[PDB]
């Protein structure tokens, strides 16, 4: 029922700055804040967001995560002169203090709680807080690495206290390790902390052994801390996506968080002087998009680092875009994660195995600019059986031109000599694909259909000439859809009930063994289907479901995540009217929140799945989550 996206920001937080020479802190400037809001303003995004005001955090809230004696000593800094401010800062590592910083720290904190409250009160669906100073390095009795108070720690503690939450997921995709967040929730199994970070075998700041993958939490919270150390600079989109598909997402969907909070720092992005990675801003559209099916979309993005005043704004804009539901940009050039990343991913997956199901089976600069993401006027066209009419969210619509109608005549004579109300299915399929591929008006659609074969063929062939350079086809059924995969412009994902050994590397054919069937599907969706689809980079996704064929629990999740491919251009062909299935498909297509899920897959199922990884990862390297054996 919740709508919109909150943007919490206030120019006051840029009214503190470093007052002495120190090359460690020079990079953390007020302009980081004004650049990112200005970038949100320029692209129409901030205007499209519910502005929620900033508040100060109360002392009672600050004591949730900080010690009175630390709070007392910081409380004294607004009265310090500059010589005194330098001395107080030297008691800490990589942090400076300013007469206004205690003020803005309470604002950065309070802005986060505001965001937590807005999201949790259903007043918005998600949101983002542009704040200074950052939080994730801050610890219970010290400032650290530009942080005074742990803004994201507050949010989770505060949502625990005030909304009685049991399961919070913090995703820290900053390039630095959020050690303050690890410390704070180390023994807490209700807060699941994932952080990737530049490590370089402990030689990169903050130089902590606890920053390594060996740290999994302590006491009753072991398994709820997940460190992914990058041991080389220059990580790429393919590395980041591998991290999500083979570590974070599999754990995150199993955890089923009741709320997701992001330490969104963008020093993890190409051009950042500190992070020195190579991921494009566009990756952050997908980072965000891949987590939105969690917690019914209740996601609180919070700003940490990011220091290239140009790499910064672009990644902010990509995050808010996806928060607002705008189409994700296609990521091209994806492939294998580099070997150092495969090493880290391999190790972290292995030490975590004793605690998670998806892994349990292994224990036996100058860049280009990010285009523009025009939101679609009518996001989702719907085409129910003739006569039947349904209730559609405001961004949906129903059904034919003469030009369209002759082409059906054309196709009839050439390919289907024996021809009713199917030449309506065919007629709409064309106009929806025409509306999708031609105009950026309709974005995706769904069409209920009678004959499978005539309709899928006409759909796929009309798409290949649209032009769609490549079509990803995902079919839930047991037949053999007339989809030739010789040319390599078509990849096919078949989810059937009968084992059917695939021969070649442009089909992926899974046969699951019934209670198991949901948790089996999700591991395969995150482990196999999403990595291949993302490497393939289709221009259009073709969804198909057979009348005959427990895939009412997962279709929403798959319909949501598969829209990260193909600018969100999916066309779903449902055989047979099913009020709940159509309503669910249209809901996911149109952008609604996906309701959460909740039994670990059968061992025969994990076994079949990595048969398919083995058979396919030489071609589709984003499938890999171990270092390659070298002959
Ligand atoms: O963004 C952050 N955390 O989220 C963050 C960023 C940097 C620092 C401390 N530091 C400062 C520099 C100056 C070079 O330009 C430097 C260089 C190498 C390693 C460490 C370095 C703390 C936190
Ligand atoms: K991080
Ligand atoms: K924890
Ligand atoms: Zn950082």
Curated annotation (Swiss-Prot):
Keywords: Cytoplasm, Hydrolase, Metal-binding, Nucleus, Zinc. One of its GO terms (biological process) is homologous recombination. Substrate binds at residues 22, 94, 307. Pfam families: Hist_deacetyl. It catalyses: N(8)-acetylspermidine + H2O = spermidine + acetate; N-acetylputrescine + H2O = putrescine + acetate; N-acetylcadaverine + H2O = cadaverine + acetate. The keyword Kinase does not apply. GO terms for molecular function: acetylputrescine deacetylase activity; acetylspermidine deacetylase activity; deacetylase activity; zinc ion binding. The active site is at 137 (proton donor/acceptor). Zn(2+) binds at residues 174, 176, 267. It is found in: Cytoplasm; Nucleus. Gene3D superfamilies: Histone deacetylase domain. It is an enzyme of class 3 (hydrolase). A motif (Substrate specificity) lies at residues 23-26. It comes from the Eukaryota. The record marks 274 as: Substrate specificity. One of its GO terms (cellular component) is nucleus. Its EC number is 3.5.1.48, 3.5.1.62. Its main location: cytoplasm. Belongs to the histone deacetylase family. HD type 2 subfamily. This is Polyamine deacetylase HDAC10. The lineage of its organism: Eukaryota, Metazoa, Chordata, Craniata, Vertebrata.
């Amino acid at each position: 029922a919740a709508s919109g996206s909150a943007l919490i920001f206030d120019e006051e937080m840029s009214r503190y700055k470093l007052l002495w020479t120190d090359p460690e802190c020079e990079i953390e400037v007020p302009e980081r804040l004004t650049v990112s809001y200005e970038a949100l303003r320029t692209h129409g995004l901030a205007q499209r967001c519910k502005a929620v005001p900033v508040r100060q955090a109360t002392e009672q809230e600050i004591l949730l995560a900080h010690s009175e004696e630390y709070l007392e000593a910081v409380k004294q800094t607004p009265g310090m002169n500059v010589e005194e401010l330098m001395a107080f800062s030297k008691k800490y590592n990589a942090v400076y203090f300013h007469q206004n910083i205690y003020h803005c720290a309470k604002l950065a904190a309070g802005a986060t709680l505001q965001l937590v409250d807005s999201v949790m009160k259903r007043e918005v669906r998600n949101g983002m807080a542009l704040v200074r100073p950052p939080g994730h390095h801050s610890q219970r009795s010290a400032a650290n690495g530009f942080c005074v108070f742990n803004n994201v720690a507050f949010a989770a503690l505060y949502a625990k206290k005030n909304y009685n939450l049991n399961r919070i997921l913090i995703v820290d995709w900053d390039v630095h390790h959020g050690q303050g967040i690890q410390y704070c929730f180390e023994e807490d199994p209700s807060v699941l902390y994932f952080s990737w970070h530049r490590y370089e075998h402990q030689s990169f700041w903050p130089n902590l052994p606890e920053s390594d993958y060996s740290s999994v939490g302590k006491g009753k919270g072991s398994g709820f801390n997940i460190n992914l150390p990058w041991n080389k600079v220059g990580m790429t989109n393919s590395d980041y996506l591998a991290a999500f598909f083979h570590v974070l997402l599999p754990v995150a969907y199993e955890f089923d968080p009741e709320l997701v909070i992001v330490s969104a720092g963008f020093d993890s992005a190409i051009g950042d002087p500190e992070g020195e990675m190579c991921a494009l801003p566009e990756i952050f559209a997908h980072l965000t998009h891949l987590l939105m099916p969690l917690a019914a979309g209740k996601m609180c993005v919070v700003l940490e680092g990011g220091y290239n005043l140009t790499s910064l704004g672009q990644s902010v804009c990509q995050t808010v875009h996806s928060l607002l539901g705008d189409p994700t940009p296609r990521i091209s050039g994806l492939g294998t994660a580099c070997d150092s990343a495969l090493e880290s991913i391999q190790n972290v997956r292995n030490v975590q195995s004793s605690y998670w199901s998806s892994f349990k089976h292994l224990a036996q600069i100058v860049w280009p600019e990010p285009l523009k993401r025009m939101p679609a006027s009518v996001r989702t066209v719907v085409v129910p059986p003739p006569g039947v009419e349904l209730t559609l969210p405001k961004n949906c619509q129903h059904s034919i031109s003469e030009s369209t109608a002759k082409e059906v005549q054309r196709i009839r004579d050439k390919h289907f000599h024996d021809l009713q109300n199917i030449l309506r299915s065919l007629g709409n399929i064309i106009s929806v694909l025409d509306r999708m591929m031609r105009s950026d008006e309709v974005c995706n659609g769904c069409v209920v259909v009678s004959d499978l074969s005539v309709s899928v063929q006409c759909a796929l062939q009309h798409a290949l000439t649209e032009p769609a350079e490549r079509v990803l086809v995902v079919y839930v059924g047991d037949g053999e859809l007339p989809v030739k995969t010789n040319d390599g412009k078509v990849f096919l994902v078949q989810i059937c009930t009968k084992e059917t050994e695939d021969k070649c590397v442009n089909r992926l054919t899974l046969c699951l063994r019934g209670e198991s069937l949901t948790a089996g599907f999700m591991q395969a969706l995150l482990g196999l289907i999403l990595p291949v689809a993302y490497e393939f980079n289709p221009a259009l996704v073709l969804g198909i479901v057979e009348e005959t064929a427990r895939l009412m629990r997962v279709w929403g999740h798959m319909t949501c995540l598969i829209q990260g491919l193909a600018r969100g251009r999916m066309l779903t062909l449902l055989q047979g009217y099913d009020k709940d299935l159509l309503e669910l498909t249209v809901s996911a297509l149109s952008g609604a929140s996906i309701s959460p899920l909740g039994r670990a897959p059968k061992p025969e199922d994990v076994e079949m799945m990595e048969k398919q990884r083995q058979r396919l990862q030489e071609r589709w390297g984003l499938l890999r989550c171990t270092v390659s054996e070298s002959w």
